[PDB]
């Protein structure tokens, strides 16, 4: 079952890396930043797959596709993983 984890970026962004999109295999949390919005939410961990950002689907998304979406997701980023 997926989660609706709402974040807010700081001078560190959302606080997590991503990998995948490199072939339609999807995007996965690659690492959590200590102190970051991700970390503090304790609702996302290394390994989680990003299904969508602010209602926008990222299952088939490419890397840069997820990268950019996340990047301009606003200040109130609604993540589904």
């Amino acid at each position: 079952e997926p989660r609706k984890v709402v974040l807010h970026r700081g001078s560190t962004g959302l606080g997590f890396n991503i990998v995948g999109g490199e072939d339609g295999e999807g995007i996965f949390i690659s690492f959590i930043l200590a102190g970051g919005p991700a970390d503090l939410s304790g609702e996302l961990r290394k390994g989680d797959r990003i299904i969508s950002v602010n209602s926008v689907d990222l299952r088939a998304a490419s890397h840069e596709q997820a990268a950019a979406a996340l990047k301009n997701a606003g200040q109130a980023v609604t993540i589904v993983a």
Partner: peptide, 6 residues
């Protein structure tokens, strides 16, 4: 090997 921080 692409990995991005966000």
């Amino acid at each position: 090997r692409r990995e991005t921080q966000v």
